[PDB]
Design a protein around this ligand. Structure first.
Ligand code: UUX
Length: 133
């Protein structure tokens, strides 16, 4: 219901430093190059306490469905198996992924008519902006 403001279909309109963020995370060259090209839609829906986030692109389609604060297993777009927890803190969806002893955090926030996705690995940050389809 505050989560309401995220629901919808959001198309990528800009990206900054995503290749460097992916490098830091450990994504391989072929997947960086092809994923980097893509123009994914991020589709967010809610049904009760279950939130679903889908990403659809020419590269890969991904889907997670989860309850806030309850850890789950995820397969990332670059085919890594991680343990994820998503919480809603001060209005921002905060997605933490843990794998192989590492961690990254992906934040989704509403800013004006945009959905802004900030990805952080160590000190490398990427910002991706999406707008309503
Ligand atoms: C490859 C990839 C990664 C890699 C990665 C995953 C997990 C942690 C760190 C890196 N990450 C993302 C996030 C969630 C982080 C932005 C996307 C992505 N962009 N739009 N929707 N999904 C894609 C992606 C998916 C389809 C098409 C293009 C890009």
């Amino acid at each position: 219901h505050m989560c309401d403001a995220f629901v919808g279909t959001w198309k990528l309109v800009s990206s900054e430093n995503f290749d460097d963020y992916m490098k830091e995370v450990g994504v391989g060259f072929a997947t960086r190059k092809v994923a980097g090209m893509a123009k994914p839609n991020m589709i967010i829906s809610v049904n009760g306490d279950v939130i679903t986030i889908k990403s659809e692109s020419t590269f890969k389609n991904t889907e997670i469905s989860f309850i806030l604060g309850q850890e789950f297993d995820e397969v990332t777009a670059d085919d890594r198996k991680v343990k994820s927890t998503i919480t809603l803190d001060g209005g921002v969806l905060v997605h933490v992924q843990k794998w192989d002893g590492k961690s990254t955090t992906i934040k989704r926030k509403r800013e004006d008519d945009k959905l802004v996705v900030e990805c952080v690995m160590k000190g490398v940050t990427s910002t991706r902006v999406y707008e309503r389809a």
